[PDB]
Amino acid sequence: AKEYCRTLFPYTGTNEDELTFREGEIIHLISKETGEAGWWKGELNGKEGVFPDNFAVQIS
Amino acid sequence: MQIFVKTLTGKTITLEVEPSDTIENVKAKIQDKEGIPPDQQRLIFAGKQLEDGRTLSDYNIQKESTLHLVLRLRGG
Numbered sequence: 001a002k003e004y005c006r007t008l009f010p011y012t013g014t015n016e017d018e019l020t021f022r023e024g025e026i027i028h029l030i031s032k033e034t035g036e037a038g039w040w041k042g043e044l045n046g047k048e049g050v051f052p053d054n055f056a057v058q059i060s
Numbered sequence: 061m062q063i064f065v066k067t068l069t070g071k072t073i074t075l076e077v078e079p080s081d082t083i084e085n086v087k088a089k090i091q092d093k094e095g096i097p098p099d100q101q102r103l104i105f106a107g108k109q110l111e112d113g114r115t116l117s118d119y120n121i122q123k124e125s126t127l128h129l130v131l132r133l134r135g136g
Contacts, residue, residue, distance in 0.1 A: 049136050
């Protein structure tokens with residue numbers, strides 16, 4: 001129905017496929033399985049990417 | 061100057077490399093201990109990826125700093 005997560009710390013993408021998240025933000029959960037341990041997949045302002053060691057907590 | 065090298069697995073490693081040191085050298089050091097090849101090593105600092113041809117002084121990396129090591133990027 002709806003599964004999102006809140007960003008607890010700032011993260012800046014280093015690659016074009018990477019996502020950038022600030023504190024007090026809203027990350028949409030796409031797939032907790034990215035093939036890399038500690039990395040989840042979410043969608044942000046038109047761009048999709050992963051974050052290091054879970055920078056988002058499923059609020060919904 | 062000591063430095064922390066974190067990993068997605070939660071493994072933090074200590075390394076000794078002054079500011080003048082080059083990023084390429086740093087990767088070589090990590091490879092000496094952890095065995096991981098520099099070709100797969102990804103160093104993240106301040107939200108930017110460290111350039112092999114640059115030095116710790118370029119990114120203003122001081123002692124007791126934390127460097128995120130990304131290994132095998134299956135995601136994106």
